[PDB]
Coordinates of C-alpha atoms and ligand atoms in Angstrom, one line a residue:
Chain A
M295 CA 12.5 -0.2 43.0
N296 CA 15.6 -2.8 41.8
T297 CA 18.5 -3.9 40.2
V298 CA 19.4 -5.9 37.2
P299 CA 23.0 -7.1 38.2
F300 CA 25.3 -8.1 35.8
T301 CA 27.8 -11.3 36.5
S302 CA 30.4 -10.0 34.2
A303 CA 30.9 -8.1 31.1
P304 CA 33.5 -10.5 29.1
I305 CA 33.2 -8.4 25.8
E306 CA 33.2 -4.6 25.0
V307 CA 29.6 -3.8 24.1
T308 CA 27.1 -1.0 24.7
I309 CA 24.1 -1.3 26.8
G310 CA 21.1 0.4 26.6
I311 CA 18.4 1.1 29.6
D312 CA 15.7 2.6 27.9
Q313 CA 16.5 5.6 26.4
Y314 CA 19.7 5.8 28.3
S315 CA 23.2 4.1 26.6
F316 CA 26.8 3.5 27.9
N317 CA 29.8 1.9 26.8
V318 CA 31.5 -1.1 28.4
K319 CA 34.8 -2.1 28.1
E320 CA 35.9 -5.9 27.9
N321 CA 36.4 -7.2 31.3
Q322 CA 35.8 -3.8 32.8
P323 CA 34.5 -4.6 36.7
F324 CA 30.5 -4.1 35.6
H325 CA 28.2 -5.5 37.7
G326 CA 24.8 -3.8 36.6
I327 CA 22.1 -1.4 36.6
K328 CA 20.2 -0.4 40.1
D329 CA 18.0 2.3 41.2
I330 CA 15.3 1.0 37.8
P331 CA 11.8 2.9 38.8
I332 CA 9.1 0.7 39.5
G333 CA 6.1 1.1 37.7
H334 CA 7.0 1.1 34.2
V335 CA 8.3 -1.8 31.7
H336 CA 11.7 -1.3 30.9
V337 CA 14.4 -2.7 28.3
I338 CA 18.0 -3.8 28.7
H339 CA 19.3 -3.8 25.5
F340 CA 23.3 -4.7 23.5
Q341 CA 25.2 -3.7 20.6
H342 CA 28.7 -5.6 20.7
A343 CA 31.5 -3.6 20.0
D344 CA 32.8 -6.5 17.5
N345 CA 29.8 -7.1 15.7
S346 CA 27.1 -4.3 15.5
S347 CA 24.8 -7.1 13.9
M348 CA 24.4 -8.5 17.7
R349 CA 21.9 -5.8 18.2
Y350 CA 19.4 -7.4 20.6
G351 CA 17.4 -6.9 24.5
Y352 CA 15.0 -8.1 27.4
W353 CA 11.7 -6.2 27.9
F354 CA 11.0 -6.7 31.5
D355 CA 9.1 -5.5 34.7
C356 CA 10.9 -5.4 37.9
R357 CA 7.7 -6.3 39.8
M358 CA 7.3 -9.8 38.0
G359 CA 10.7 -11.5 39.5
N360 CA 14.4 -11.0 40.1
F361 CA 16.2 -10.5 36.7
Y362 CA 19.4 -11.0 36.0
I363 CA 22.2 -10.9 33.1
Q364 CA 25.2 -13.4 32.4
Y365 CA 26.8 -13.9 29.4
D366 CA 26.9 -16.8 27.4
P367 CA 30.1 -17.5 25.6
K368 CA 28.8 -20.3 23.9
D369 CA 25.5 -18.4 22.2
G370 CA 28.0 -15.2 22.4
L371 CA 25.2 -12.9 24.2
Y372 CA 24.3 -11.3 27.0
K373 CA 21.4 -13.6 28.4
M374 CA 18.6 -12.3 31.1
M375 CA 18.0 -15.0 33.5
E376 CA 15.6 -15.2 36.4
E377 CA 17.0 -15.7 40.2
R378 CA 14.0 -17.7 42.1
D379 CA 16.2 -17.5 45.4
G380 CA 15.3 -13.8 46.8
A381 CA 17.5 -14.0 49.7
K382 CA 20.5 -15.3 47.2
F383 CA 19.4 -12.2 44.4
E384 CA 19.5 -9.7 47.8
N385 CA 22.7 -10.9 49.0
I386 CA 24.4 -10.4 45.4
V387 CA 23.1 -7.1 44.6
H388 CA 23.9 -5.6 48.3
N389 CA 27.8 -6.6 47.6
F390 CA 27.9 -5.2 44.0
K391 CA 25.9 -2.0 45.5
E392 CA 28.6 -1.7 48.6
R393 CA 31.5 -2.3 46.0
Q394 CA 29.8 0.8 43.8
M395 CA 30.2 -1.2 40.5
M396 CA 26.3 -0.4 39.4
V397 CA 25.5 2.1 37.1
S398 CA 22.5 4.2 38.5
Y399 CA 19.5 4.6 36.3
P400 CA 20.1 8.0 35.3
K401 CA 16.5 9.9 35.5
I402 CA 16.0 13.8 35.9
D403 CA 13.3 14.4 38.6
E404 CA 11.1 16.7 35.8
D405 CA 11.6 13.9 33.1
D406 CA 8.6 12.3 32.1
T407 CA 10.0 10.9 28.7
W408 CA 9.6 7.2 29.8
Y409 CA 6.6 7.1 31.4
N410 CA 5.6 8.9 27.6
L411 CA 6.8 6.7 25.5
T412 CA 5.4 3.6 27.7
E413 CA 1.9 5.0 29.0
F414 CA 0.0 1.8 27.6
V415 CA 2.5 -0.9 27.0
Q416 CA 1.8 -3.7 29.9
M417 CA 4.4 -6.9 30.2
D418 CA 1.4 -9.0 29.9
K419 CA 0.8 -7.7 26.5
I420 CA 4.1 -8.2 25.1
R421 CA 3.8 -11.7 26.4
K422 CA 1.8 -11.8 23.6
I423 CA 3.6 -10.3 20.8
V424 CA 6.7 -12.0 22.1
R425 CA 5.7 -16.1 22.7
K426 CA 8.4 -17.7 25.2
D427 CA 5.9 -18.4 28.2
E428 CA 8.4 -20.4 30.5
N429 CA 10.3 -16.8 30.9
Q430 CA 8.9 -13.7 32.6
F431 CA 10.8 -11.0 30.3
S432 CA 10.7 -10.7 26.3
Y433 CA 14.0 -11.2 23.9
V434 CA 13.6 -8.8 20.6
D435 CA 16.6 -8.2 18.3
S436 CA 17.0 -6.3 15.1
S437 CA 16.2 -9.6 12.7
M438 CA 13.1 -11.0 14.3
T439 CA 10.6 -11.0 11.0
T440 CA 6.6 -10.2 12.3
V441 CA 3.8 -12.7 11.3
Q442 CA 2.9 -10.3 9.0
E443 CA 6.2 -10.4 7.7
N444 CA 6.7 -13.9 7.6
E445 CA 2.9 -14.9 5.4
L446 CA 4.6 -12.6 2.2
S447 CA 9.8 -18.0 8.3
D448 CA 10.5 -19.7 12.1
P449 CA 6.9 -18.9 14.1
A450 CA 9.1 -19.4 17.5
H451 CA 11.2 -16.4 16.9
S452 CA 8.5 -14.2 15.4
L453 CA 6.7 -10.5 16.4
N454 CA 3.2 -11.8 16.8
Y455 CA 2.0 -7.9 16.0
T456 CA -1.8 -7.6 14.9
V457 CA -1.9 -8.4 10.8
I458 CA -3.2 -4.9 9.4
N459 CA -3.8 -4.9 5.8
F460 CA -6.0 -2.2 4.3
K461 CA -6.3 -4.2 0.5
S462 CA -8.0 -7.6 2.9
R463 CA -11.2 -9.2 3.2
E464 CA -11.0 -8.1 6.8
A465 CA -10.4 -4.0 6.3
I466 CA -13.3 -4.5 3.4
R467 CA -17.1 -5.5 3.8
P468 CA -18.6 -7.0 0.6
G469 CA -20.7 -4.3 -0.8
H470 CA -18.9 -1.7 0.7
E471 CA -15.7 -1.5 -1.2
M472 CA -15.0 2.7 -1.8
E473 CA -16.8 3.7 1.5
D474 CA -14.0 0.9 3.2
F475 CA -11.0 2.1 1.6
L476 CA -11.1 5.3 1.1
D477 CA -12.5 5.6 5.1
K478 CA -10.9 3.4 7.5
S479 CA -13.3 3.7 10.1
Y480 CA -15.2 0.0 9.9
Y481 CA -11.7 -1.3 10.3
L482 CA -10.2 0.7 13.3
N483 CA -14.0 0.9 15.2
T484 CA -15.2 -2.5 14.6
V485 CA -13.0 -5.0 13.4
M486 CA -9.5 -3.7 15.6
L487 CA -11.0 -1.6 18.4
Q488 CA -14.4 -3.6 19.7
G489 CA -13.0 -7.0 17.8
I490 CA -10.0 -7.5 18.3
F491 CA -7.8 -5.0 20.7
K492 CA -11.5 -4.4 23.2
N493 CA -10.1 -0.8 23.7
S494 CA -7.9 2.1 22.8
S495 CA -5.2 1.4 25.7
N496 CA -4.2 -2.1 24.2
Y497 CA -4.2 -0.7 20.6
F498 CA -2.3 2.5 21.7
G499 CA 0.2 -0.1 24.0
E500 CA 0.6 -2.5 20.6
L501 CA 1.7 1.2 18.5
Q502 CA 4.2 2.2 21.3
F503 CA 6.1 -1.1 21.9
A504 CA 6.5 -1.0 17.9
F505 CA 7.5 2.1 18.1
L506 CA 10.5 1.3 21.0
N507 CA 11.2 -2.1 19.0
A508 CA 11.6 -0.1 15.7
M509 CA 14.1 2.7 17.6
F510 CA 16.3 0.0 19.8
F511 CA 16.7 -2.9 17.8
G512 CA 16.5 -0.9 14.1
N513 CA 13.7 -4.0 13.9
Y514 CA 12.2 -3.1 10.1
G515 CA 8.8 -5.3 10.7
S516 CA 8.1 -3.3 14.3
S517 CA 8.8 0.1 12.4
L518 CA 6.2 -1.1 9.3
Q519 CA 3.5 -2.0 12.3
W520 CA 3.9 1.2 13.7
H521 CA 3.2 2.9 10.7
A522 CA 0.0 1.2 10.1
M523 CA -1.2 1.9 13.0
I524 CA -1.1 5.6 12.7
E525 CA -1.8 5.3 9.3
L526 CA -5.3 3.1 10.6
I527 CA -6.2 6.4 12.5
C528 CA -5.2 9.3 10.1
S529 CA -7.1 7.7 7.4
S530 CA -10.5 6.5 9.6
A531 CA -13.5 9.8 9.3
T532 CA -14.9 8.6 12.6
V533 CA -12.1 8.6 15.7
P534 CA -13.1 9.4 19.5
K535 CA -12.3 12.6 20.3
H536 CA -10.0 10.9 23.4
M537 CA -7.9 8.8 21.2
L538 CA -7.0 11.8 18.4
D539 CA -6.0 13.6 21.5
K540 CA -3.7 10.9 23.0
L541 CA -2.6 9.9 19.4
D542 CA -1.0 13.3 19.3
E543 CA 0.6 13.3 22.7
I544 CA 1.9 9.9 21.9
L545 CA 3.5 10.4 18.4
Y546 CA 5.0 14.2 19.9
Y547 CA 7.0 11.7 22.5
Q548 CA 7.9 9.5 19.7
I549 CA 9.5 11.8 17.2
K550 CA 10.5 14.3 20.6
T551 CA 12.7 10.5 21.6
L552 CA 14.3 9.7 17.5
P553 CA 17.7 10.3 17.1
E554 CA 18.0 13.3 14.6
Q555 CA 20.4 10.8 12.5
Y556 CA 18.1 8.2 12.5
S557 CA 14.7 9.9 10.9
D558 CA 15.9 8.8 6.9
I559 CA 15.7 5.1 8.2
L560 CA 12.7 5.3 10.9
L561 CA 10.2 7.6 9.3
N562 CA 8.2 6.7 6.3
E563 CA 8.0 9.9 4.3
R564 CA 4.6 8.7 2.1
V565 CA 3.0 7.8 6.2
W566 CA 3.9 10.7 7.5
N567 CA 3.0 13.2 4.9
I568 CA -0.3 11.8 4.1
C569 CA -1.1 11.6 7.9
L570 CA -0.6 15.3 8.6
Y571 CA -1.2 17.0 5.3
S572 CA -3.9 14.7 3.9
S573 CA -5.6 12.3 5.7
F574 CA -9.2 13.1 7.7
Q575 CA -7.2 14.1 10.6
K576 CA -4.7 16.0 8.8
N577 CA -5.7 18.7 11.3
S578 CA -6.3 16.9 14.4
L579 CA -2.4 16.0 15.3
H580 CA -1.3 20.0 16.4
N581 CA 1.8 19.2 18.9
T582 CA 3.1 15.9 16.4
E583 CA 2.6 18.4 13.4
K584 CA 4.8 21.2 15.0
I585 CA 7.2 19.0 16.5
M586 CA 7.5 16.9 12.6
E587 CA 8.1 20.6 11.2
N588 CA 10.7 21.9 13.3
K589 CA 12.4 19.0 13.7
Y590 CA 12.5 16.9 10.1
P591 CA 11.2 19.6 7.7
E592 CA 13.1 17.8 4.9
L593 CA 10.8 14.7 5.2
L594 CA 7.4 16.8 4.9
Chain B
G83 CA 4.0 -6.6 -14.0
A84 CA 2.9 -4.4 -16.0
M85 CA 1.9 -5.2 -19.5
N86 CA 4.6 -4.0 -22.5
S87 CA 6.4 -4.0 -25.7
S88 CA 8.7 -6.4 -24.4
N89 CA 5.5 -9.0 -23.6
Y90 CA 3.1 -8.4 -26.7
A91 CA 2.3 -12.2 -27.4
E92 CA 1.2 -12.8 -24.0
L93 CA -1.9 -10.6 -25.4
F94 CA -2.9 -13.6 -27.9
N95 CA -2.2 -16.6 -25.7
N96 CA -4.7 -19.0 -24.3
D97 CA -4.8 -17.6 -20.8
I98 CA -8.3 -15.8 -20.4
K99 CA -7.4 -12.2 -20.3
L100 CA -9.9 -8.8 -20.4
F101 CA -8.5 -5.5 -21.1
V102 CA -10.3 -2.8 -19.1
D103 CA -10.8 1.0 -20.5
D104 CA -12.7 3.9 -18.1
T105 CA -11.8 6.7 -20.0
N106 CA -15.3 6.8 -21.3
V107 CA -17.3 6.3 -18.1
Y108 CA -17.7 9.7 -16.9
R109 CA -18.6 11.7 -19.8
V110 CA -19.4 15.7 -19.7
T111 CA -20.4 18.4 -21.6
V112 CA -19.2 22.0 -19.8
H113 CA -21.7 25.4 -20.1
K114 CA -22.0 28.3 -19.2
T115 CA -25.5 29.0 -16.6
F116 CA -27.7 31.7 -17.2
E117 CA -25.9 33.7 -13.8
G118 CA -22.1 33.3 -16.0
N119 CA -20.9 30.2 -13.8
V120 CA -19.9 26.9 -15.3
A121 CA -21.9 23.8 -15.3
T122 CA -21.0 20.3 -16.1
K123 CA -24.2 17.8 -17.7
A124 CA -23.2 14.0 -17.7
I125 CA -23.8 12.0 -20.9
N126 CA -24.5 8.0 -20.5
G127 CA -20.6 6.5 -21.0
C128 CA -19.8 2.9 -20.9
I129 CA -16.9 0.5 -19.4
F130 CA -15.1 -1.2 -22.3
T131 CA -14.1 -4.3 -21.7
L132 CA -12.3 -6.7 -24.4
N133 CA -10.7 -10.2 -24.8
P134 CA -7.8 -9.1 -27.2
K135 CA -7.7 -13.0 -28.6
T136 CA -11.3 -13.4 -29.1
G137 CA -12.6 -10.1 -30.1
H138 CA -15.5 -10.4 -27.6
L139 CA -16.3 -6.6 -26.2
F140 CA -18.7 -6.7 -23.1
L141 CA -19.9 -2.7 -23.4
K142 CA -21.4 -2.1 -19.9
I143 CA -23.6 1.2 -20.6
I144 CA -23.4 3.6 -17.8
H145 CA -26.4 5.9 -18.0
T146 CA -26.4 9.4 -16.4
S147 CA -28.9 8.2 -13.6
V148 CA -25.7 6.3 -11.8
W149 CA -24.4 10.0 -11.0
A150 CA -28.0 11.4 -9.4
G151 CA -27.3 13.0 -6.5
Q152 CA -23.9 11.6 -5.9
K153 CA -20.1 13.4 -5.2
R154 CA -16.4 13.7 -6.2
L155 CA -18.0 12.1 -10.0
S156 CA -14.6 11.1 -11.1
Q157 CA -13.5 9.4 -8.0
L158 CA -16.9 7.4 -7.9
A159 CA -16.7 6.2 -11.7
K160 CA -13.3 4.2 -11.0
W161 CA -15.0 2.5 -8.2
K162 CA -18.3 2.2 -10.3
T163 CA -16.0 0.6 -13.2
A164 CA -14.3 -1.7 -10.7
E165 CA -18.1 -2.8 -9.2
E166 CA -19.3 -3.4 -13.1
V167 CA -16.0 -5.4 -13.6
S168 CA -16.3 -7.3 -10.7
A169 CA -20.2 -8.4 -10.8
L170 CA -19.3 -9.3 -14.6
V171 CA -16.7 -11.4 -13.1
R172 CA -18.9 -13.0 -10.8
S173 CA -21.8 -13.5 -13.9
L174 CA -19.5 -15.7 -16.1
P175 CA -19.1 -19.1 -15.9
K176 CA -15.6 -20.3 -13.8
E177 CA -13.7 -21.6 -16.9
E178 CA -15.1 -18.2 -18.8
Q179 CA -13.4 -16.2 -16.1
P180 CA -10.0 -14.3 -16.8
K181 CA -6.8 -15.1 -15.5
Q182 CA -6.4 -11.6 -16.0
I183 CA -7.4 -7.8 -15.8
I184 CA -5.3 -5.4 -17.6
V185 CA -5.8 -1.6 -16.7
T186 CA -5.3 0.5 -19.4
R187 CA -5.2 3.3 -16.5
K188 CA -2.9 3.2 -13.4
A189 CA -5.9 5.2 -11.3
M190 CA -8.4 1.5 -12.0
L191 CA -5.5 -0.7 -9.8
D192 CA -6.5 -0.2 -6.7
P193 CA -10.8 0.0 -7.2
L194 CA -10.1 -3.1 -9.0
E195 CA -8.1 -5.1 -6.4
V196 CA -10.3 -3.8 -3.8
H197 CA -13.3 -5.1 -5.8
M198 CA -11.7 -8.8 -6.7
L199 CA -10.4 -9.4 -3.1
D200 CA -12.5 -12.7 -3.6
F201 CA -10.8 -13.7 -6.7
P202 CA -6.8 -13.6 -5.6
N203 CA -5.8 -15.7 -8.2
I204 CA -7.0 -13.0 -10.9
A205 CA -4.0 -11.1 -11.7
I206 CA -4.7 -7.1 -11.9
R207 CA -2.3 -5.3 -14.3
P208 CA -1.2 -1.9 -15.6
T209 CA 0.0 -1.8 -18.8
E210 CA 2.6 0.5 -20.5
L211 CA 1.3 0.0 -23.7
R212 CA -0.9 3.9 -24.9
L213 CA -3.9 2.0 -26.1
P214 CA -6.7 3.9 -28.4
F215 CA -9.7 2.2 -26.3
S216 CA -10.9 6.1 -25.6
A217 CA -12.4 6.4 -29.5
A218 CA -14.4 3.7 -28.7
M219 CA -17.1 6.3 -28.9
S220 CA -16.4 6.8 -32.4
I221 CA -17.5 3.7 -33.7
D222 CA -20.8 4.5 -34.7
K223 CA -22.6 1.4 -33.3
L224 CA -21.4 1.5 -30.4
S225 CA -22.0 5.3 -30.2
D226 CA -25.9 4.8 -31.0
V227 CA -26.4 1.9 -28.1
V228 CA -24.8 4.5 -25.4
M229 CA -26.4 7.4 -26.3
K230 CA -30.1 6.0 -26.9
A231 CA -29.8 3.6 -23.4
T232 CA -32.7 4.8 -21.3
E233 CA -31.5 2.6 -18.2
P234 CA -28.0 0.6 -17.4
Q235 CA -27.7 -2.1 -20.2
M236 CA -24.8 -4.6 -20.8
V237 CA -24.6 -5.1 -24.8
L238 CA -22.1 -7.8 -26.0
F239 CA -20.2 -7.4 -29.4
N240 CA -17.1 -8.9 -31.6
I241 CA -15.2 -5.8 -32.1
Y242 CA -13.4 -7.9 -34.7
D243 CA -16.2 -8.5 -37.0
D244 CA -15.6 -11.8 -38.7
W245 CA -12.1 -11.2 -39.0
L246 CA -10.7 -14.0 -37.3
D247 CA -12.0 -16.3 -39.9
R248 CA -8.7 -14.8 -42.1
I249 CA -6.8 -13.5 -39.7
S250 CA -4.7 -14.3 -36.7
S251 CA -5.9 -12.4 -33.0
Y252 CA -2.2 -10.8 -33.2
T253 CA -3.3 -9.0 -36.9
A254 CA -6.6 -8.6 -35.7
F255 CA -5.5 -6.7 -32.6
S256 CA -3.0 -4.6 -34.4
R257 CA -5.7 -3.6 -37.2
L258 CA -8.2 -2.2 -34.1
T259 CA -5.4 -0.4 -32.9
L260 CA -4.4 1.2 -35.9
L261 CA -8.1 2.1 -36.7
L262 CA -9.0 3.4 -33.2
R263 CA -5.5 5.2 -33.1
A264 CA -6.5 7.2 -36.6
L265 CA -10.0 7.8 -35.0
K266 CA -8.4 8.9 -31.9
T267 CA -5.9 11.4 -33.7
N268 CA -8.5 12.3 -36.8
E269 CA -12.0 11.2 -36.3
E270 CA -13.5 13.2 -39.3
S271 CA -10.9 12.0 -41.8
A272 CA -10.7 8.5 -40.7
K273 CA -14.2 7.8 -40.8
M274 CA -14.1 9.2 -44.5
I275 CA -11.3 7.0 -45.4
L276 CA -13.9 3.7 -43.8
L277 CA -17.3 4.7 -45.2
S278 CA -16.9 7.9 -48.4
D279 CA -17.3 4.6 -50.5
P280 CA -20.8 3.6 -50.7
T281 CA -20.2 0.3 -52.7
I282 CA -18.3 -1.4 -49.6
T283 CA -21.1 -0.9 -46.4
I284 CA -21.1 -2.4 -42.9
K285 CA -23.4 -5.8 -42.2
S286 CA -26.1 -5.5 -39.9
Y287 CA -24.2 -7.8 -37.6
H288 CA -21.0 -5.8 -38.0
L289 CA -19.1 -2.6 -36.8
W290 CA -16.8 -2.0 -39.7
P291 CA -17.1 -2.6 -43.5
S292 CA -17.1 -5.7 -45.1
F293 CA -13.6 -5.2 -47.0
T294 CA -11.5 -7.8 -49.2
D295 CA -7.9 -8.8 -47.6
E296 CA -6.7 -6.2 -50.7
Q297 CA -9.5 -2.9 -49.6
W298 CA -7.9 -3.7 -45.9
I299 CA -4.1 -3.2 -47.1
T300 CA -5.6 0.0 -49.1
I301 CA -7.6 0.8 -45.2
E302 CA -4.4 0.0 -43.2
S303 CA -2.5 2.3 -45.4
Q304 CA -4.3 5.3 -45.3
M305 CA -4.7 5.0 -41.8
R306 CA -0.9 5.1 -41.4
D307 CA -1.0 8.0 -43.9
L308 CA -3.4 9.7 -41.8
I309 CA -1.5 9.5 -38.5
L310 CA 1.3 10.7 -40.0
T311 CA -0.1 13.5 -41.8
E312 CA -1.6 14.3 -38.1
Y313 CA 1.6 13.9 -36.7
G314 CA 3.4 16.4 -39.6
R315 CA 0.6 19.6 -38.6
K316 CA 0.9 18.8 -35.1
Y317 CA 4.3 19.1 -34.8
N318 CA 5.2 21.6 -37.9
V319 CA 7.2 18.3 -39.2
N320 CA 7.9 17.7 -43.1
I321 CA 6.9 14.0 -43.2
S322 CA 7.3 14.1 -47.0
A323 CA 11.4 13.4 -46.1
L324 CA 11.0 11.0 -43.4
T325 CA 12.5 7.0 -43.7
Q326 CA 10.6 4.0 -43.4
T327 CA 12.7 3.2 -39.4
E328 CA 10.9 7.2 -38.6
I329 CA 7.5 6.3 -40.2
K330 CA 7.5 3.2 -38.1
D331 CA 9.1 4.2 -34.7
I332 CA 6.2 7.3 -34.8
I333 CA 3.1 5.5 -35.2
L334 CA 4.5 2.3 -32.7
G335 CA 6.0 5.0 -30.6
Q336 CA 2.4 6.8 -29.9
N337 CA 1.4 3.2 -29.1
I338 CA 3.4 3.5 -26.1
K339 CA 3.4 5.1 -22.5
Ligands
SYA39 C1 24.7 -11.3 38.7 O1 25.0 -12.5 39.6 C2 24.0 -13.2 39.9 C3 23.1 -12.9 40.1 F1 21.9 -12.5 40.6 C4 21.7 -14.2 40.4 F2 20.7 -13.9 40.9 C5 22.3 -15.3 40.1 C6 23.6 -16.0 39.7 C7 23.9 -17.2 39.2 O2 24.5 -17.6 38.1 O3 23.4 -18.2 39.7 C8 24.6 -15.1 39.2 F3 25.7 -15.2 38.7

């Protein structure tokens, strides 16, 4: 129900909280974010005013612990920390709330945008993609490479997305080369869903997490992973009806939220044209096709 | 990367390589039906797999039975080609396997890459060269073995006959591409040049006539003339005016995508 207090804001910075953002001035008496909705993961993110290359943030869930942000003048960034002393934390939050030095998470009552973008995203799955087991929150930034990108270098600071490679022995059964390359159903249903993800919810959770890291950090590898997971479904002739109907909802809200001015960097022409107009599922994504045709008809 | 004019000597180095041409795998005649619709009838085809250094030709005959009850035959043909090239590589001893496979058509890249996943060190490359390997079925003995086949068959040829006893692989390939380009441009006129003189025959174990070195120079000149004459007839160009740069440029320009 909770609050992420800030020690101070010593450097001018754009702060993101989920899909919202606001500008904080150098040494402005800012002491954090209150009224964060319980029940969802959240991401607090940063872009320094004096250096837009500093673009980074933290995935967290207020149900797992008491988290605060403190600026580190050595490493030159806003760090998330956990406070183990519940009484101290409550006392600090109460002080800042009484002095009205926190911004309020600005959720419109009617507005399901954040739920719609994070429906399948769980903190325990984020912590397996982003490996730093001593913290309950996960650091991501614009420059972090994926395990797949590193294969084609520091393995500790990498995004452990599931590797998808259409021209790999994993994707192609010996003896079923043409079948498996032209119809990715085997790779989707047996290898990925039954084999690695165990269920569609885990698959969608990773797809949604990839999109959010692409959008909020401009993380290029995350963008590749998001498109690969879309293309793997759209390129499969055999997909459960429930998964197609849900993918249509998922993509609709992603396309709805995407900033218009970032469509040229965040959307892959080839994948979207293929998925909407050529693939097995070209007629299965009604809501996605309509929003894409009305918002980004130049890409198509 | 892509095999082009810049990297032509690489064809004749000591790294085993094969060209794969799939343009005669799926072959049809188009005809009217009794109801006045149109129907295709498949005829036997072949994969043209050639070592350009040794002249070794692995002619895999594609019998019409391959197509029976199959759909999207032009797509299947690329995958059947990749399947058979993959099978040929696996059949060869390790020291005879190619280091590189060059496909004459870019549509063969994904099918061959996917069939060759077990061979990550064999490079699959396109070429910028416009190679006249489609004219293989203008070589009478290759046409004869394809059309007579009653089942899938592999037949091994040396497409250079015994030329490498007297000339380099580079020159042998240049002679082959000029003959095939002439056969592709004007088949009747090319066969006339090759076969009209009855005192020069084809050995039982050869594909081409037993020309002396001086007779090969004459034949080569007559093939160049045929290609230039046909380029004149095509584009309505007075070829009698052209210079040697113009002429060289037109014959080799046709060897270039
Ligand atoms: C935001 O202020 C806090 C806070 F909430 C907290 F839990 C701990 C500290 C600390 O430095 O030990 C702090 F400065």
